[PDB]
Design a binder for these strands. Structure first.
Lengths: 48, 47, 53
DNA sequence: GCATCCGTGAGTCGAGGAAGCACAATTTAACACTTTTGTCAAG
DNA sequence: CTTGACAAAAGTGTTAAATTGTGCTATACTGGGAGCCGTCACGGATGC
């Protein structure tokens, strides 16, 4: 059944129990932004 | 200040390019429409 | 350049190819205003210290 | 004309950061005395 | 607009330590040492 409408899905659905892992790649450790910051010594370009 | 960003200038990496080429005994010069030298170092490197 | 131009009339293709390659370098030096001896360094330029910090 | 050698090239982001010594010459740290501000009353 | 008095504060002259630079050793010594190693492609280069 559809929880939003209460009507069933028009076709039978493969439902079961499956083993799912949470991987070490998390968006918390990957989101990054920068307006200004440290610059390199010779080229004076932003660091990375 | 609420203003539009100004017109840019010559990058500092190109200045690094010229000086590194000069350290190889190569005379790299930037010229104008009339083939006259143009100083990209703002007079800071001319003796 | 004059000798190389005279040798450019040799019937052999290898001789003309060798003369042309030498003449191309000679023409480059003549047109540019450079001197061949400038290829040997008497004074070594030193890079500014901030580029080699 | 043909092996053989020498040189140059081979994707992008990210994340990982073992002598000593003596002696001379030179520089530097401490004072001690001026000369110069800085800050007061006096106007 | 000053006029003297003072009080630090920077400048100057010796002065010694502390640091730094240089010369010198007398039995006889007389040609180095790690390289060792799985691509493949092109263009070019005298060479023959």
């Amino acid at each position: 059944y559809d929880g939003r409408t209460g009507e069933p899905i028009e076709g039978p659905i493969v439902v079961g129990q499956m083993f799912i892992m949470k991987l070490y790649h998390m968006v918390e450790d990957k989101m990054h932004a920068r307006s200004t910051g440290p610059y390199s010594l010779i080229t004076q370009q932003p660091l990375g | 200040k609420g203003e539009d960003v100004p017109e840019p200038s010559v990058p500092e990496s190109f200045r690094v390019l010229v000086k590194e080429l000069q350290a190889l005994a190569l005379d790299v010069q930037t010229l104008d429409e009339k083939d006259n030298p143009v100083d990209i170092f703002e007079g800071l490197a001319s003796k | 350049e004059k000798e190389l131009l005279e040798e450019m009339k040799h019937p052999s293709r290898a001789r003309r190819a060798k003369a042309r390659k030498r003449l191309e370098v000679v023409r480059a030096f003549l047109d540019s205003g450079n001197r061949p001896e400038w290829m040997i360094l008497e004074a070594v330029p030193v890079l500014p210290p901030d580029l080699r910090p």
